[PDB]
Enzyme design. Sequence first.
Site, mmCIF file in Angstrom:
data_model
loop_
_atom_site.group_PDB
_atom_site.id
_atom_site.type_symbol
_atom_site.label_atom_id
_atom_site.label_comp_id
_atom_site.label_asym_id
_atom_site.label_seq_id
_atom_site.Cartn_x
_atom_site.Cartn_y
_atom_site.Cartn_z
ATOM 1 N N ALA A 204 0.788 -1.240 0.000
ATOM 2 C CA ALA A 204 0.000 0.000 0.000
ATOM 3 C C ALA A 204 0.827 1.301 0.000
ATOM 4 O O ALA A 204 0.255 2.386 0.107
ATOM 5 C CB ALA A 204 -0.963 -0.007 1.179
ATOM 6 N N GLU B 122 1.980 9.444 7.900
ATOM 7 C CA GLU B 122 1.322 8.698 8.986
ATOM 8 C C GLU B 122 0.165 9.429 9.670
ATOM 9 O O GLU B 122 -0.827 8.792 10.012
ATOM 10 C CB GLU B 122 2.335 8.296 10.060
ATOM 11 C CG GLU B 122 3.366 7.297 9.599
ATOM 12 C CD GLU B 122 4.201 6.784 10.751
ATOM 13 O OE1 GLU B 122 4.097 5.582 11.054
ATOM 14 O OE2 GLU B 122 4.948 7.587 11.367
ATOM 15 N N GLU C 247 -16.054 -8.634 28.831
ATOM 16 C CA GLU C 247 -15.698 -8.126 30.152
ATOM 17 C C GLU C 247 -14.643 -6.998 30.112
ATOM 18 O O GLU C 247 -14.628 -6.154 31.006
ATOM 19 C CB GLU C 247 -15.244 -9.282 31.046
ATOM 20 C CG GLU C 247 -15.372 -9.008 32.537
ATOM 21 C CD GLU C 247 -14.963 -10.194 33.397
ATOM 22 O OE1 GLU C 247 -15.259 -11.348 33.011
ATOM 23 O OE2 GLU C 247 -14.338 -9.971 34.462
HETATM 24 N N1 GTP Z 1 6.337 -1.428 17.122
HETATM 25 C C1 GTP Z 1 6.540 -1.707 15.814
HETATM 26 N N2 GTP Z 1 6.230 -0.751 14.904
HETATM 27 C C2 GTP Z 1 6.417 -0.996 13.582
HETATM 28 C C3 GTP Z 1 6.958 -2.289 13.136
HETATM 29 N N3 GTP Z 1 7.032 -2.241 11.794
HETATM 30 C C4 GTP Z 1 6.575 -1.020 11.413
HETATM 31 N N4 GTP Z 1 6.224 -0.292 12.481
HETATM 32 C C5 GTP Z 1 5.665 1.063 12.483
HETATM 33 O O1 GTP Z 1 4.503 1.081 11.644
HETATM 34 C C6 GTP Z 1 4.510 2.264 10.852
HETATM 35 C C7 GTP Z 1 4.703 1.842 9.403
HETATM 36 O O2 GTP Z 1 3.666 0.914 9.088
HETATM 37 P P1 GTP Z 1 3.905 -0.589 8.563
HETATM 38 O O3 GTP Z 1 3.154 -1.556 9.453
HETATM 39 O O4 GTP Z 1 5.367 -0.840 8.280
HETATM 40 O O5 GTP Z 1 3.154 -0.508 7.134
HETATM 41 P P2 GTP Z 1 2.219 -1.670 6.517
HETATM 42 O O6 GTP Z 1 1.025 -1.893 7.408
HETATM 43 O O7 GTP Z 1 3.092 -2.846 6.161
HETATM 44 O O8 GTP Z 1 1.613 -0.920 5.211
HETATM 45 P P3 GTP Z 1 2.330 -0.735 3.764
HETATM 46 O O9 GTP Z 1 3.812 -0.723 4.017
HETATM 47 O O10 GTP Z 1 1.751 0.588 3.325
HETATM 48 O O11 GTP Z 1 1.870 -1.934 2.973
HETATM 49 C C8 GTP Z 1 5.651 3.101 11.403
HETATM 50 O O12 GTP Z 1 5.147 3.914 12.456
HETATM 51 C C9 GTP Z 1 6.633 2.096 11.953
HETATM 52 O O13 GTP Z 1 7.495 2.614 12.975
HETATM 53 C C10 GTP Z 1 7.278 -3.271 14.192
HETATM 54 O O14 GTP Z 1 7.742 -4.393 13.885
HETATM 55 N N5 GTP Z 1 7.046 -2.913 15.467
#
Ligand code: GTP
Lengths: 424, 437, 63, 309
Positions: B99, B183, B254
């Site tokens: 995405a 974001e 709950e």
């Molecule tokens: N805590 C945590 N945050 C993460 C991780 N991977 C990505 N993020 C956070 O998630 C956000 C980026 O979203 P992602 O989940 O990588 O994106 P996605 O849902 O794969 O969506 P697309 O890349 O657009 O397909 C940022 O704020 C990152 O810091 C993880 O393994 N742990």
Amino acid sequence: MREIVHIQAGQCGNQIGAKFWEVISDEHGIDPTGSYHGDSDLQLERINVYYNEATGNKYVPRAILVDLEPGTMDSVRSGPFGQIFRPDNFVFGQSGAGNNWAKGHYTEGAELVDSVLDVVRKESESCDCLQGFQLTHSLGGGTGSGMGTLLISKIREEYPDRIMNTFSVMPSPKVSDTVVEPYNATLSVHQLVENTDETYCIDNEALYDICFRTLKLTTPTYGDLNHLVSATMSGVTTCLRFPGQLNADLRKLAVNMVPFPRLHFFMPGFAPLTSQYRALTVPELTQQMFDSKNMMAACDPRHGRYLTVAAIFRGRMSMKEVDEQMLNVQNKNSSYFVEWIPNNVKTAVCDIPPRGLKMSATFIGNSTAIQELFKRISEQFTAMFRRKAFLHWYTGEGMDEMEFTEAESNMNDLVSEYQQYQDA
Amino acid sequence: MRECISIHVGQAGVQIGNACWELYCLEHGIQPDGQMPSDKTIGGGDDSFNTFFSETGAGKHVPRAVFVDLEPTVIDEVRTGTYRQLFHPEQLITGKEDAANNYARGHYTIGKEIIDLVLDRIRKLADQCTGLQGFLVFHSFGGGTGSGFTSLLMERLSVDYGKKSKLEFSIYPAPQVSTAVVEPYNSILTTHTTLEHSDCAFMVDNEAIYDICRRNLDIERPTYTNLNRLISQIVSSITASLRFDGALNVDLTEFQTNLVPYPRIHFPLATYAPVISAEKAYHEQLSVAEITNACFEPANQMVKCDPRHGKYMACCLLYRGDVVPKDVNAAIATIKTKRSIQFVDWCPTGFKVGINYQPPTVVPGGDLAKVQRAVCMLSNTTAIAEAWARLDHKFDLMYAKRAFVHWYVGEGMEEGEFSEAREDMAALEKDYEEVGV
Amino acid sequence: MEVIELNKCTSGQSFEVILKPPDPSLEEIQKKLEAAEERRKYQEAELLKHLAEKREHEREVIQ
Amino acid sequence: MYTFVVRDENSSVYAEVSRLLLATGQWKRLRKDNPRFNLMLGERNRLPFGRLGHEPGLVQLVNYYRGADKLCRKASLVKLIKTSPELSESCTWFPESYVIYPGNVWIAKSGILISSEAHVIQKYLEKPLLLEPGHRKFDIRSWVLVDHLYNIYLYREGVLRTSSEPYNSANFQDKTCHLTNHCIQKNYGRYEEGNEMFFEEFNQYLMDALNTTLENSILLQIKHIIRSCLMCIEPAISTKHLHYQSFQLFGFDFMVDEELKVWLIEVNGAPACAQKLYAELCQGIVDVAISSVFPLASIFIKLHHHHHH
Ligand SMILES: Nc1nc2c(ncn2[C@@H]2O[C@H](COP(=O)(O)OP(=O)(O)OP(=O)(O)O)[C@@H](O)[C@H]2O)c(=O)[nH]1
Ligand SMILES: Nc1ncnc2c1ncn2[C@@H]1O[C@H](COP(=O)(O)OP(=O)(O)CP(=O)(O)O)[C@@H](O)[C@H]1O
Ligand SMILES: Nc1nc2c(ncn2[C@@H]2O[C@H](COP(=O)(O)OP(=O)(O)O)[C@@H](O)[C@H]2O)c(=O)[nH]1
Ligand SMILES: CC(C)(C)c1[nH]cnc1/C=c1\[nH]c(=O)/c(=C/c2ccccc2)[nH]c1=O
Ligand SMILES: [Ca+2]
Ligand SMILES: [Ca+2]
Ligand SMILES: [Mg+2]
Ligand SMILES: [Mg+2]
């Protein structure tokens, strides 16, 4: 999304393009005949992005070599890494384009374009998931400028959902082949504003000044300019060509770098500038890559404001020190980054350094100061166009004065648009 | 018992799933191949852990999990990793093209071509359940898949499973570990479209987990692996009452009744103590009073905010390890007189305590030290609105200039959905202030 | 301070302590998914219409 | 090189602090809506404390203590004193005050009504201390600076905001003898310049007329009230361990009665300094509250007392 299709068009396009494959093949451990002789598995983990795998475990670049004359493409084939390219992907005409945008875009290049697109279709077909295209060219000549932008337009028709990026060399009187370069560039810029997602604005003025002032070379050749170009092209393609936990394709990068569709002309930069023994500290890289002297487009970033910044560091260094230094320049020069895009400077680190340097940094800047570049070409354009000078070369190939007027207007609109966000 | 299906959408969702199921396996004594020696009823059972694990005739214990990602590379690390046998391939769904951090691409463009497939694979797990409770949904606010596809799923899950409860485990965006610049848009867009469909949502600001890893684990530059292993400890804390014998938070309904009296204000603040480094040579073990008192320090919260300037609607103390009711009550007595703990007038000033005698399990070779006792406080405080105000301010700055908006519109989305989403958030911030001031 | 509803078991115990007393349908979703696809296909039509005009200008110049 | 912002233009005090910072070469001012600051000099109403301390690689300080409004609004100050055990209903140094929403003399305030018939309704001090020659009422203003560590710094120079009219028991409607404010007076400047008597002169008057000192007869009680009031609210407002830090300048208004007893009238969150004292106080705010947190290349007295019991 993994595979990228590369295209190089014209003398300049094929020159800087051939250097790109010289640099990255060394970085991926591929020799002049195409065989892998590396050591790390990281060199082959994302080799599919730029290479196809052939019989006998040979690696063939996903590269299409275009020109309207044989000359330069014969030099590429004779040159050091010339044997690695697929012979079917050398698509060339005979009469050339005489530094004429009209010849490239409308007459000579029209006769050749469909056979180039067949090779693009051939390469695009056998690609699991094509993420986009990249093009090397100048905007000052005929082939790279006129035919390059024609190809870009045709590729957008056939592949409307793929990313189109360019490495576009800008002309300058300092490094000038013909007086009509401003015409050819203005006609090309209008095409790039519509049909590319990113354009890396390599200015030959800046490459000359870097070679002259900050590298003490009295008489710089095109090889000296191209050395700086190939280093930068390696840098911008690093994060796709290697890991390291960076989950990004061209679209994801384009989404985060381009807040407005027409404003996708970037300011490339490299540190350290080469032609060394003492490796640079993380503070030095950070100061140098943000320094105006290291910018590949002859604009003063202090005269504009940064919409987005991307910086990719190479080598074994402390990420903590990188974060500290990248936060130091933002928080001490906060007027030059737009407040209405929070957290617009982003950073990656890659462990593998490039050839010769222990650590380096590549700078990608979407600054509003790039208007200075387009203003400079707009002035050179108008100087000639107010007297309709040299126009007979273009009108003889069927163009109208109206098309020049349009292009002039479109580039001055681009400059107006950059001015809007500089003051906001 | 009643079964719970965990859904992991996007990179952050998937990789946090990995960490949680790894930890669940160590806690229940289930091994990477899926055998659970201590389980005696082979082939099935209605135990507490069976809410999270189904069983096969061969004796394998299979997570009730669905992993969804719009590109393969992250879920491919599950398929080839240590817990590869644990999952059935049909549970692990992947697209080809992601995405691109674009809500609209994840929700509308790429969402449409995969939504019917994912619901089908969810229905394959729901048909194995004798009495489904509902869903634990794991995702990022900042990703396109995390934000966009999650909201479309949550919309459809309300239609296909209208009687069932839906919980979120949401990662709130932090610039120090995100390379995504858009974001704030993705976060507000998904929060708007998901709000009516989510019964209780546990936000985790990456900023808080990051500084906890710096300050308390002595980690110079915390990776996602550092953050996820710590997040999964909190998640485990929260879900332990569904997986073990007990009388507090025994079902998903709950959680809503205890923590969410006002349905829109369904974002409880997690606070967790103690976080102690395994590399630390000498550690004096903390008492019930010290770790309960640590639940009211902002430096231990999952989202940095100030509960002293706000009001509580509910509070839950979930203890793990050597803890007895009278030591907890003595700690609550001392804490009430020292700190500023103001409740809303319609809700009783009180605490729902849950104790499980098994101390926290730590991943071998992990960053967390073994501890005698630990606690996770879940409190519904109006102070967490601070996180919305920040996210909304960032939105307003970018959106005033229409910055990046063309990417969303280009994928079919209307510009009106931006201000429509922002108004729901403007109403949400206003709901929090009415209650809290 | 009253300690109510105390429930114990072999793996733990729980209690409360009181300090002081006081959706759209499948039609609408599948509709508006498709409405964005119409805007997506209208925008791609306007692009291939615009590029078709560029192709006729290309023929007009060489002629 | 540290950075700051200015979001209160009316603030005469922090106008000078802004000026003094700029005139060092180590503090750049940014725009009002720039997030990348070290110091915020914030607005009075709706200061966004929720956006502070969330910018990576920036230690962020602000010149207001969130929640300090509970001491500065009159309605909440009365409610704080009655409800808090450490102040209590039987508080010797606060006048008897009540809350009803919109010797038996009272005063109403939040348009000021002093009568027996008739917001907060406070017991009016019928027999105050009267300066001579004049037979006239005053109030004392003291400036208190609480830093990020919650050190309570009393500034050594206060001021008596005097009335110029003789005090009258029978005549309540005439405001110029009962109300001793600076704006209400402007006999404006008969006995002292701008109705402002400073601590040196007031000490000397006490010596000559009463055979005592300001330190003994009044200031000891002032230091007890300032300390009692701020330590009461420390748990509610302290920014120790918190992701952003706060300091704040307060204005404590006092009344001395005929038997030399000091009464608290109001605490002021955004107080203005007296004309002479700006230069010294605003340099002190920089030295103690700002430069402690952000070091570059005593006028206060510290209030601390640990009696064991
Ligand atoms: N805590 C945590 N945050 C993460 C991780 N991977 C990505 N993020 C956070 O998630 C956000 C980026 O979203 P992602 O989940 O990588 O994106 P996605 O849902 O794969 O969506 P697309 O890349 O657009 O397909 C940022 O704020 C990152 O810091 C993880 O393994 N742990
Ligand atoms: N209980 C009382 N007994 C005697 N005088 C009183 C009083 N309450 C108020 N006053 C007088 O009224 C004057 C102004 O009232 P008050 O100090 O409550 O409001 P204010 O807002 O003018 C102070 P500031 O604006 O400096 O914070 C004081 O200077 C004081 O002399
Ligand atoms: N940086 C760089 N610029 C070049 C090179 N060759 C030509 N140019 C520039 O490109 C323009 C001429 O275009 P060219 O590529 O020779 O024409 P084409 O073959 O018709 O595309 C002029 O502005 C030159 O300065 C090169 O090798 N490097
Ligand atoms: C986080 C980081 C540093 C990876 C980043 N964030 C946004 N941009 C980038 C980098 C790039 N962004 C680009 O857009 C980019 C363009 C590119 C890549 C390959 C070929 C042509 C262009 N190359 C980059 O390295
Ligand atoms: Ca011909
Ligand atoms: Ca069983
Ligand atoms: Mg040439
Ligand atoms: Mg992704």
